[PDB]
Design an enzyme around this catalytic site. Structure first.
Site, short mmCIF file in Angstrom:
data_model
loop_
_atom_site.label_atom_id
_atom_site.label_comp_id
_atom_site.label_asym_id
_atom_site.label_seq_id
_atom_site.Cartn_x
_atom_site.Cartn_y
_atom_site.Cartn_z
N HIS A 197 0.83 -1.20 0.00
CA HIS A 197 0.00 0.00 0.00
C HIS A 197 0.87 1.25 0.00
CE1 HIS A 197 -3.40 -2.59 0.97
NE2 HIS A 197 -2.73 -3.08 2.00
N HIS B 43 6.28 6.90 6.17
CA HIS B 43 5.89 6.47 4.83
C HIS B 43 5.31 7.68 4.12
CE1 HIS B 43 2.24 6.15 7.25
NE2 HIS B 43 1.63 6.57 6.14
N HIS C 95 2.38 9.07 0.86
CA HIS C 95 1.26 8.88 -0.07
C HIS C 95 1.52 9.81 -1.24
CE1 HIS C 95 -1.12 6.94 3.14
NE2 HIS C 95 -0.41 7.75 3.91
N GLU D 141 -2.97 13.51 1.16
CA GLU D 141 -4.22 13.11 1.80
C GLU D 141 -4.93 14.32 2.40
OE1 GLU D 141 -3.10 9.50 4.17
OE2 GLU D 141 -4.14 8.62 2.48
N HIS E 233 4.22 10.98 6.25
CA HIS E 233 3.66 10.68 7.56
C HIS E 233 4.73 10.04 8.42
CE1 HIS E 233 -0.67 10.55 5.82
NE2 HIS E 233 -0.21 11.78 6.04
N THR F 102 -5.36 6.67 8.18
CA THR F 102 -5.98 6.93 6.88
C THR F 102 -6.08 5.69 6.01
OG1 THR F 102 -3.95 7.55 5.72
CG2 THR F 102 -5.15 9.30 6.90
N1 LIG Z 1 -1.55 6.89 6.78
S1 LIG Z 1 -1.43 6.85 8.47
O1 LIG Z 1 -2.65 7.38 9.12
O2 LIG Z 1 -0.23 7.50 9.02
C1 LIG Z 1 -1.38 5.11 8.94
C2 LIG Z 1 -2.32 4.26 8.37
C3 LIG Z 1 -2.31 2.93 8.72
C4 LIG Z 1 -1.36 2.46 9.62
N2 LIG Z 1 -1.47 1.07 9.96
C5 LIG Z 1 -2.04 0.12 9.24
C6 LIG Z 1 -1.97 -1.05 9.96
N3 LIG Z 1 -1.40 -0.76 11.12
C7 LIG Z 1 -1.11 -1.61 12.25
C8 LIG Z 1 0.05 -2.35 12.34
C9 LIG Z 1 0.27 -3.13 13.47
C10 LIG Z 1 -0.68 -3.15 14.49
F1 LIG Z 1 -0.47 -3.91 15.61
C11 LIG Z 1 -1.83 -2.40 14.40
C12 LIG Z 1 -2.05 -1.62 13.28
F2 LIG Z 1 -3.19 -0.87 13.18
C13 LIG Z 1 -1.10 0.54 11.13
O3 LIG Z 1 -0.58 1.11 12.03
C14 LIG Z 1 -0.44 3.31 10.22
C15 LIG Z 1 -0.44 4.65 9.87
ZN LIG Z 2 -0.06 7.70 5.89
#
Ligand SMILES: NS(=O)(=O)c1ccc(-n2ccn(-c3ccc(F)cc3F)c2=O)cc1
Ligand SMILES: [Zn+2]
Length: 257
Positions: A61, A91, A93, A103, A116, A195
């Site tokens: 992703h 990371h 986007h 975003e 982010h 997000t």
């Molecule tokens: N784009 S953001 O808001 O910065 C963003 C979006 C998604 C994540 N993400 C996705 C899956 N996870 C995750 C990984 C390990 C865990 F134990 C729990 C999670 F939600 C996570 O932190 C982390 C950050």
């Molecule tokens: Zn992000």
């Protein structure tokens, strides 16, 4: 499984993740005239001098640069936050075109990309516990515009050939995330969510006013990544952004005026 395509993209996510229609979803449009200056907001404290990067991973992703978060080495404090938040990963986007990719938006303006830097509140002991809490995460968001190259980004750009496809990882030590910051730490802040799925409502968002500039060659290299795994049909990793969500009963606060 969810993604960013026509059949599994953001408008579909609520079917598996009903919190997608929740009360504090991210990202949002930042209306600069309606954000309120809060003089009680403290300057951000970004303490990245001891950061220990470990690895870079294509997760299908986006790509994450991951850090050692088993000690207070790279921490965010101050601003709207109570307590200490440890950097776990960053990371981006980005778009298929320079006119989209971020975003968050500012007065409906989309940037070419958004960085982010994800941090978790140390009072909850680990990241997986933190995401279950309304004050569990702090994400520092930084907009990218296309112009001059960002020297601090180039070592990220240069390793991307080694993680082209989903599931690939590469060693990525001694990377200094201070090289990704703009000059000013002026920011907007609001309570929001992850997000991507699971879209948990655990994030204090801190979005910097000042974008960083990256070159057209740098963003072109992001667009050569792949959503798919090796040996699967090739789909370019572009437009991995969720559009702005309703602000609902939230006020965006500004650290500056
Ligand atoms: N784009 S953001 O808001 O910065 C963003 C979006 C998604 C994540 N993400 C996705 C899956 N996870 C995750 C990984 C390990 C865990 F134990 C729990 C999670 F939600 C996570 O932190 C982390 C950050
Ligand atoms: Zn992000």
């Amino acid at each position: 499984h969810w993604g960013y395509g026509k059949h599994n993209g953001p408008e579909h996510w609520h079917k598996d993740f009903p919190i997608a229609k929740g009360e504090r979803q991210s990202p949002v449009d930042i209306d600069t005239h309606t954000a309120k200056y809060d003089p009680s907001l403290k300057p951000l404290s970004v303490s990245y001098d001891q950061a220990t990067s470990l690895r870079i991973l294509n997760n299908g992703h986006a790509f994450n640069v991951e850090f050692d978060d088993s000690q207070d080495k790279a921490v965010l404090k101050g601003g709207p936050l109570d307590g200490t938040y440890r950097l776990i990963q960053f990371h981006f986007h980005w778009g298929s075109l320079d006119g989209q990719g971020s975003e968050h938006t500012v007065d409906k303006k989309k940037y070419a990309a958004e960085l982010h830097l994800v941090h978790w509140n140390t009072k909850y002991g680990d990241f997986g516990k933190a995401v279950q809490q309304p004050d569990g995460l702090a994400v520092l968001g930084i907009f990218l515009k296309v112009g001059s190259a960002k020297p601090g980004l180039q070592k990220v750009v240069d390793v991307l050939d080694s993680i082209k496809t989903k599931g690939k990882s590469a060693d990525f030590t001694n990377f200094d995330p201070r090289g990704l910051l703009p000059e000013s730490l002026d920011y907007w802040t609001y309570p929001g969510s992850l997000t991507t799925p699971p879209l948990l409502e655990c994030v204090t968002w801190i979005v910097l006013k000042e974008p960083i500039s990256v070159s057209s060659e740098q963003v072109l290299k992001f667009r050569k990544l792949n959503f798919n795994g090796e040996g699967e049909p090739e789909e370019l990793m572009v437009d991995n952004w969720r559009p702005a969500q309703p602000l609902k009963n939230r006020q965006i606060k500004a650290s500056f005026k």
